[PDB]
């Protein structure tokens, strides 16, 4: 009621997220917006919270308040030449995404657009998985940006947690290339054809061999054979621990 100062003359991220304003919650910096909303927000009201997931701070009377993220796009952050993240930091960012995804999958939620441009970074360098309206609760069922999509989703329009695992592999690839575009010489229509030819993304220059074998496991032709986000958190923790 009297615990929110809202700056209606100051929008976050130059309009790239719509009308979202700078706020101060009683002093915490925040993002303020005024049923079509993200399902993670409706879950945080009715049900749901994780440090690696961008979620609701609260509701004010309506005013939907989320926390402020200094770097609203992880893809932009790793692509900016003023930042020089190490191979250990980039693997660390991926481990955080896998932690948020392991949590969301336990909640039976399917993201459907897991990419580095849909992850945010704050001032303490903590990564959060954001949803812009595409994630769905799968409830009791086990199913519900073509270059990040799994082969069985391109062919059938059905999404499962294992199709998110495929996208996580492309996110890992984006991380090791510091924001390079996947399949740069391929058109989005012939992606299914390009893949069915027996192809996958090439191993980047600074991607350690054990991390590339993990990306290949994520892109396994059979969805049921892909590792879970628990196995990915386990496997990536070990690789990360080998670096000083």
Q: How many residues interact with ligand MDI (rule CB under 6 A)?
A: 20
Q: Of the candidates 23, 50, 53, 66, which one interacts with ligand MDI according to CB under 6 A?
A: 66
Nearest CA among 148, 126, 1 for reference residue 70? 126
Q: Of the candidates 43, 44, 55, 72, which one interacts with ligand MDI according to CB under 6 A?
A: 72
Supply angle C-alpha 104, 164, 93, rounded to 5.
70
CB of 124 within 8 A of CB of 71?
A: no
158 assigned ligand-binding residue: no
The interface mask with ligand MDI, positions 102-131, x = CB under 6 A, is: ------------------x---------x-
Q: Is 33 near ligand MDI (CB under 6 A)? A: yes
Comparing CB distances to ligand MDI, the nearer of 113 and 152 is: 113
The whole-angstrom separation of Cα 96 and Cα 111 is 15
Catalytically active residues are 113
19 assigned ligand-binding residue: yes
Comparing CB distances to ligand MDI, the nearer of 126 and 242 is: 126
CB of 206 within 8 A of CB of 187?
A: no
- DSSP class of residue 123 equals T
Strands 119-121 and 109-110 turn out to be: unpaired
CB of 127 within 8 A of CB of 168?
A: no
Q: Is 29 near ligand MDI (CB under 6 A)? A: no
Q: Of the candidates 3, 5, 8, 37, which one interacts with ligand MDI according to CB under 6 A?
A: 37
């Amino acid at each position: 009621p009297s615990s929110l100062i809202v700056h209606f003359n100051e929008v976050i991220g130059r309009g790239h997220f719509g009308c979202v304003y700078h706020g101060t919650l009683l002093k915490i910096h925040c993002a303020v917006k005024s049923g079509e909303v993200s399902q993670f927000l409706t879950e945080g009201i009715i049900m749901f919270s994780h440090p690696n997931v961008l979620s609701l701070l609260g509701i004010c009377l309506p005013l939907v308040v989320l926390p402020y993220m200094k770097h609203g796009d992880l893809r932009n952050f790793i692509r900016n030449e003023t930042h020089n993240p190490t191979v250990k930091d980039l693997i660390g960012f991926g481990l955080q995404v896998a932690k948020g995804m392991k949590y969301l999958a336990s909640k039976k939620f399917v993201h459907r657009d897991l990419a580095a441009r849909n992850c945010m970074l704050d001032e303490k360098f903590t990564v959060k998985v954001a949803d812009f309206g595409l994630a769905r609760d799968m409830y009791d069922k086990e199913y519900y940006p073509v270059k990040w999509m799994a082969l069985e989703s391109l062919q059938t329009q059905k999404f499962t947690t294992k199709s998110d695992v495929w996208s996580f592999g492309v996110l890992l690839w984006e991380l090791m290339t510091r924001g390079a575009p996947p399949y740069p010489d391929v058109n989005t229509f012939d992606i299914t054809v390009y893949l069915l030819q027996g192809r996958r993304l090439l191993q980047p220059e600074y991607c350690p061999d054990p991390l590339y074998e993990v990306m290949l496991k994520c892109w396994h032709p059979k969805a049921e054979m892909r590792p879970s986000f628990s196995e990915l958190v386990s496997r990536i923790s070990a690789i990360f621990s080998t670096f000083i």
